[PDB]
Write an enzyme that holds these catalytic residues in place. Structure first.
Site, PDB file in Angstrom:
ATOM      1  N   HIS B  44       0.685  -1.258   0.000  1.00 13.68           N
ATOM      2  CA  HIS B  44       0.000   0.000   0.000  1.00 13.68           C
ATOM      3  C   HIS B  44       0.726   1.333   0.000  1.00 13.68           C
ATOM      4  CE1 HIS B  44      -2.486  -2.368   3.442  1.00 13.68           C
ATOM      5  NE2 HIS B  44      -2.937  -2.751   2.313  1.00 13.68           N
ATOM      6  N   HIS B  46       0.858   4.693   1.343  1.00 18.52           N
ATOM      7  CA  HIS B  46       0.586   5.453   2.555  1.00 18.52           C
ATOM      8  C   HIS B  46       0.807   6.901   2.194  1.00 18.52           C
ATOM      9  CE1 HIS B  46       0.676   2.121   5.733  1.00 18.52           C
ATOM     10  NE2 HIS B  46       0.237   1.651   4.631  1.00 18.52           N
ATOM     11  N   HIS B  61      -2.453   5.296   4.310  1.00 14.75           N
ATOM     12  CA  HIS B  61      -3.116   4.858   3.084  1.00 14.75           C
ATOM     13  C   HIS B  61      -3.691   6.219   2.607  1.00 14.75           C
ATOM     14  CE1 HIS B  61      -3.658   0.402   3.981  1.00 14.75           C
ATOM     15  NE2 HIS B  61      -2.429   0.903   4.060  1.00 14.75           N
ATOM     16  N   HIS B  69     -11.395   1.141   3.079  1.00 10.97           N
ATOM     17  CA  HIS B  69     -10.418   0.188   2.621  1.00 10.97           C
ATOM     18  C   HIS B  69     -10.972  -0.999   1.870  1.00 10.97           C
ATOM     19  CE1 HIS B  69      -6.457  -1.974   2.992  1.00 10.97           C
ATOM     20  NE2 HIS B  69      -7.273  -2.974   2.990  1.00 10.97           N
ATOM     21  N   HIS B  78      -9.372   2.606  -0.910  1.00 12.48           N
ATOM     22  CA  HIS B  78      -8.494   3.736  -0.856  1.00 12.48           C
ATOM     23  C   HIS B  78      -7.601   3.805  -2.137  1.00 12.48           C
ATOM     24  CE1 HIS B  78      -8.331   2.903   3.608  1.00 12.48           C
ATOM     25  NE2 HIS B  78      -9.257   3.775   3.290  1.00 12.48           N
ATOM     26  N   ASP B  81      -4.737   1.424  -1.703  1.00  9.88           N
ATOM     27  CA  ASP B  81      -4.871  -0.040  -1.732  1.00  9.88           C
ATOM     28  C   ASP B  81      -4.400  -0.648  -3.045  1.00  9.88           C
ATOM     29  OD1 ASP B  81      -6.119   0.706   0.550  1.00  9.88           O
ATOM     30  OD2 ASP B  81      -8.180   0.299  -0.237  1.00  9.88           O
ATOM     31  N   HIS B 118       3.659  -4.572   4.491  1.00 11.15           N
ATOM     32  CA  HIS B 118       3.113  -5.048   5.685  1.00 11.15           C
ATOM     33  C   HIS B 118       3.311  -6.519   5.938  1.00 11.15           C
ATOM     34  CE1 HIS B 118       0.986  -1.598   6.361  1.00 11.15           C
ATOM     35  NE2 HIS B 118       0.297  -1.656   5.250  1.00 11.15           N
ATOM     36  N   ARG B 141       4.140  -2.983   9.299  1.00  7.73           N
ATOM     37  CA  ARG B 141       5.106  -2.469   8.330  1.00  7.73           C
ATOM     38  C   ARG B 141       6.482  -3.020   8.546  1.00  7.73           C
ATOM     39  NH1 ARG B 141       2.361   4.182   9.885  1.00  7.73           N
ATOM     40  NH2 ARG B 141       0.920   3.402   8.514  1.00  7.73           N
TER      41      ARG B 141
HETATM   42 CU   LIG Z   1      -0.851  -0.169   4.597  1.00  8.85          CU
HETATM   43 ZN   LIG Z   2      -6.294   0.935   2.602  1.00 12.24          ZN
END
Ligand SMILES: [Cu+2]
Ligand SMILES: [Zn+2]
Ligand SMILES: [Cu+2]
Ligand SMILES: [Zn+2]
Lengths: 151, 151
Positions: B44, B46, B61, B69, B78, B81, B118, B141
């Site tokens: 993702h 961020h 995100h 999400h 998002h 994503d 992640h 993360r």
């Molecule tokens: Cu994330």
């Molecule tokens: Zn997300």
């Protein structure tokens, strides 16, 4: 846009954190740099945010206006040049600068770009020969960082 | 913004290098990542730029249109994503994604934010409850990079 940051790291002992905030038409650049050799050193924005070859993959100074190299001040300056930061000690210092040239507003926006601190002082707008006149004669980059948003 | 790069560094032995090419009104994201586990990993963007204090600092995100999400594939997700990156047997992940929602372009632009990986999978906003809906659960993360502009 608006409010961005950059963390300076390298294979040497040089580190720093620089902040950038748009205060309308101008960009206020502040921060600390540590782990340096006392005196002034070259402080520029290097065309790319590429860290694949360390601070080398950054390449030259951001000059979207095909020009030469100077100081913050010369009309004949590279968007990417902010001149020299001054260290004292520890081997620290001083980042407070206000620029009418650089931005984060696109076509002159300095984000996704690299912030470099060189191992020698910039001849700024005047002086040298060939590498002066588009470089600074600053030289070896010991810390760099890709400029990213913040908020 | 017609090309970009991200260098996935982490504070564990996790790492990779990801590439973004604005090839349509589609951004094709390519690369590899080593250090991983097996399994799908959350992948993702961020919203932010500096890791001035790790992968922690990237925030949440990138969601310009305050939505919930989800997955790549999805209409309620998002901009951040991108889903999951599956691992091997050892060492690698192969990334091959095209995304209708990001760009380098301006606005929904991902230049200057952070690319994170992640622990554990993203179970695309629905498997679960409250946090799914957010984070994806896709868990924690440890390799992140500030996306920058590429030659
Ligand atoms: Cu994330
Ligand atoms: Zn997300
Ligand atoms: Cu330079
Ligand atoms: Zn220059």
């Amino acid at each position: 846009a608006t409010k961005a940051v950059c963390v300076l790291k390298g294979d040497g002992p040089v580190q720093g954190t620089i902040h950038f905030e748009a205060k309308g038409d101008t960009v206020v650049v502040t921060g600390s740099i540590t782990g340096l050799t006392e005196g002034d050193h070259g402080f520029h924005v290097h065309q790319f945010g590429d860290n694949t070859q360390g601070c080398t993959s950054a390449g030259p100074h951001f000059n979207p206006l095909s020009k030469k190299h100077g100081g913050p001040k010369d009309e004949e300056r590279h968007v990417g040049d902010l001149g020299n930061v001054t260290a004292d000690k520890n081997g620290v210092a001083i980042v407070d600068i206000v620029d009418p040239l650089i931005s984060l507003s696109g076509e002159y926006s300095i984000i996704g770009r690299t912030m470099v601190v060189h191992e020698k002082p910039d001849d700024l707008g005047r002086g040298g020969n060939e590498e002066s006149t588009k470089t600074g004669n600053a030289g070896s980059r010991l810390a760099c960082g890709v400029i990213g948003i913040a908020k």
